[PDB]
Amino acid sequence: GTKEQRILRHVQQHAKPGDPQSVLEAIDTYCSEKEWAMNVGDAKGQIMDAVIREYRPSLVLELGAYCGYSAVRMARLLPPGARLLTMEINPDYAAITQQMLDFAGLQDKVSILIGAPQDLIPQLKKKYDVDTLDMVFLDHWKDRYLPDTLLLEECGLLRKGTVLLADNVIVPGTPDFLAYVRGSSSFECTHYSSYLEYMKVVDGLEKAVYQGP
Ligand SMILES: O=P([O-])([O-])O
Ligand SMILES: O=P([O-])([O-])O
Ligand code: NA
C-alpha cells in the first residue's frame, strides 16, 4: 500500500483501540523504524502540546493532513466545548486521517473538510458558522503557508492573540513565510528547533501570534 495506508495498518494491528497515546506511539515507532520521520513525539509533538497548553484554544484549524498524527496529537488535549477543524485537499490523506481519529476514539472532536484551503477558508464564516479562530496549525504543504496566512487575514478569521503554529519550517526553507511573519508588526514570532540527540535540526516550528492588522 501507500505509506499512509501502511501507517494506518500498523496502528490498527499494534495500537490499543480508543487510546490516543497508544496510537501516537505506534505511529512514532513505525515512522522511526522506517526512517520516514524520527521521533516525531519529541521533535514536534511536545511543542504542539506546549502551545495548546499555553493558549487553551476552543477552536483549532489544521491546514493539511497526511496520516492523522497531528490531528490525534491536538484533539486528545481538547476539553468538552473545544474542537478541531482539519482541511486537506487529498481525499486519500483525509480518509486515513479520519480512520486514525476513529481508531483513537477522537472522531467527535474533529471535523474533516476535504478541499483546497483557498476554496474552504472563505466559507468558514458563512458555511461553518465560525467567527474567529483561536489557533491555526499549518501541517504539511509549506509552499502554502504564506498564502494561507494571508487568506486567513483577508477573511477576518484571525484575532488578537490567535496563535499560528507551523511545522517543518527549517532554514533555508519557507524563506518568504518567515520573512513575512517576522517582518510584519502583526505577528509576534518564536522559532523552535528540535535537534533530538544530535547536531542537525530534525524539525523546526514557527509560532506566530497575531497582534492585529
Ligand atoms: O501525518 P500528519 O500529522 O497528518 O501530517
Ligand atoms: O538554528 P536554530 O533555531 O538557531 O537552533
Ligand atoms: Na513580526
Side-chain angles (χ1 to χ4, degrees), residues 40-54:
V40 290
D42 285 5
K44 72 181 180 188
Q46 292 170 11
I47 286 161
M48 295 167 64
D49 290 2
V51 173
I52 285 171
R53 290 172 180 144
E54 178 172 357

Side-chain angles (χ1 to χ4, degrees), residues 4 7 27 31 44 48 62 64-73 86 88 93 97 137 139-140 167:
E4 65 269 17
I7 293 163
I27 296 171
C31 285
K44 72 181 180 188
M48 295 167 64
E62 170 181 352
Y66 182 57
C67 77
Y69 180 93
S70 299
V72 170
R73 190 86 197 190
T86 300
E88 171 52 37
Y93 297 170
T97 293
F137 185 70
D139 176 50
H140 82 0
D167 189 49

